[PDB]
Amino acid sequence: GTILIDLSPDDKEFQSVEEEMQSTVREHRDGGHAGGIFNRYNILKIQKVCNKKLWERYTHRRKEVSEENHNHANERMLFHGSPFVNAIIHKGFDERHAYIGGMFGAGIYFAENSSKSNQYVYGIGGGTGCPVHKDRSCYICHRQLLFCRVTLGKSFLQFSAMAHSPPGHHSVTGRPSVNGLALAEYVIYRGEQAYPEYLITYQIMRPE
Ligand SMILES: CC(=O)c1ccc(-c2nc3ccccc3c(=O)[nH]2)cc1
Numbered sequence: 001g002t003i004l005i006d007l008s009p010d011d012k013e014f015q016s017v018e019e020e021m022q023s024t025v026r027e028h029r030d031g032g033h034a035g036g037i038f039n040r041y042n043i044l045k046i047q048k049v050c051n052k053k054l055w056e057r058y059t060h061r062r063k064e065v066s067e068e069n070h071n072h073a074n075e076r077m078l079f080h081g082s083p084f085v086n087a088i089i090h091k092g093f094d095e096r097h098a099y100i101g102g103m104f105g106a107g108i109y110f111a112e113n114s115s116k117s118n119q120y121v122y123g124i125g126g127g128t129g130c131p132v133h134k135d136r137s138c139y140i141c142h143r144q145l146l147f148c149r150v151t152l153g154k155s156f157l158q159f160s161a162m163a164h165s166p167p168g169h170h171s172v173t174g175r176p177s178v179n180g181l182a183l184a185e186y187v188i189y190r191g192e193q194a195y196p197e198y199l200i201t202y203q204i205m206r207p208e
């Protein structure tokens with residue numbers, strides 16, 4: 001059911017999505033091990049992800065969460081990186097895209113920092129890196145991220161350095177509490193709480 005629509009870089013919708021991508025890059029405590037060394041991306045393509053079935057699945061759930069939370073979906077646009085981006089855009093999110101070993105439990109994880117999600121493009125800890133060169137910091141190979149609509153609803157705050165939600169809540173927010181530059185990270189426990197709206201194709205760029 002899915003079809004992908006290119007946006008022109010002249011479109012304002014492309015620009016703002018790129019802006020979110022570029023402006024949420026940060027340094028990472030692993031020195032660049034997982035996701036590579038870079039301060040910004042070369043954006044190659046941005047595509048709107050259109051799937052009626054998956055969209056209705058998502059809004060049906062949103063209406064449920066909103067009605068459980070004083071008419072407040074608490075909807076966000078967050079980044080997701082995953083070896084299964086192609087599956088995700090054709091079949092949507094489910095328990096097979098959960099991060100089983102994640103710090104907030106087995107769930108689908110999302111980031112405010114694009115560079116956080118970029119660490120998961122080739123797998124956990126960056127895996128063995130790009131398939132062609134086995135290089136976690138490859139500047140050549142094309143990477144892909146999803147920018148997603150995510151219904152957090154009532155989010156359980158966890159301060160820090162497929163399962164269920166903690167009862168009474170629809171998601172978990174990983175409020176970062178050591179690194180003063182790191183943004184929040186979020187976890188949902190049902191695929192229906194995210195829609196993979198944009199497929200961003202990019203290369204990380206070697207710093208000057
Ligand atoms: C292979 C698999 O099960 C898997 C796939 C993707 C991630 C992932 N984790 C995150 C954690 C925090 C913030 C963003 C992300 C993020 O964008 N992706 C984790 C595991």
Ligand SMILES: [Zn+2]
Binds near residue numbers: 132133139140
């Ligand atoms: Zn490569």
